[PDB]
Amino acid sequence: ADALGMIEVRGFVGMVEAADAMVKAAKVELIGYEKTGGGYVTAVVRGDVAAVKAATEAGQRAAERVGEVVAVHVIPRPHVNVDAALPLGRTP
């Protein structure tokens, strides 16, 4: 039931700085990363609803400085089925 925050960058470095900045800005858990290939990389965080929204916006400002940021999105209360089938960390 934890929120969901994602950052997708076309540079492995961009994701890292994006990941670090988030866990530095709010009580968030960084689960892992799914590399979609083609240089595209996605960082995933989960936690409180607001913390993610604050973390996500805080990661973009840090990543935009050193990478081709592609997408930034936040999902407050995802469906049970999503966590059940996707590698998003809150799977039983």
């Binding site: 800005a25 709010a26 009580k27 409180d48 913390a51 604050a54």
Partner: protein
Amino acid sequence: ITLRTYIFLDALQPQLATFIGKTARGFLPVPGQASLWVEIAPGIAINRVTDAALKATKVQPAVQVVERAYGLLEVHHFDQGEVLAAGSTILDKLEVREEGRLKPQVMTHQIIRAVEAYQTQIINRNSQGMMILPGESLFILETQPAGYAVLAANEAEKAANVHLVNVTPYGAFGRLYLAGSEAEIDAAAEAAEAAIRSVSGVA
């Protein structure tokens, strides 16, 4: 004599009388009333100002001090009307209307999220109010002059679920710190900063 603050506080939110009182060494107010706030330089004209209020009304004062710089005046009472009489008399002694107060300035307002476990203990060295729990969030505000801040601190808790840090109607500048979980801070600070400009005055 010149004028700096003229703020009439409607009905204070509870938690103020604490930090108000822990700062005050006078007739502490209590939550649910109304109170008045006047800071002027020099902090002696205040002392003359306090009579015109106290002589002509039914009020009660907590702050009359010069521990910071020049002195500060607060009087408090439950009935909005009785206080409003005291304030209107004060300016009449100064022979100045409302719009003689200075416009407030909004210099530094920024929101800080998830403070590192260290910085919490250090702010609390300023243990004037509540403690910034480790890893909540903090808001910072600056206005010139100093009296305007207590307005913000009131309008703050009045609008969000916040724990109060420390407030400055004292000094050459009005500075503000607030603490609590994230969404409230965003909701509280956003209310304060908007509250400050709406005041009418001269530059």
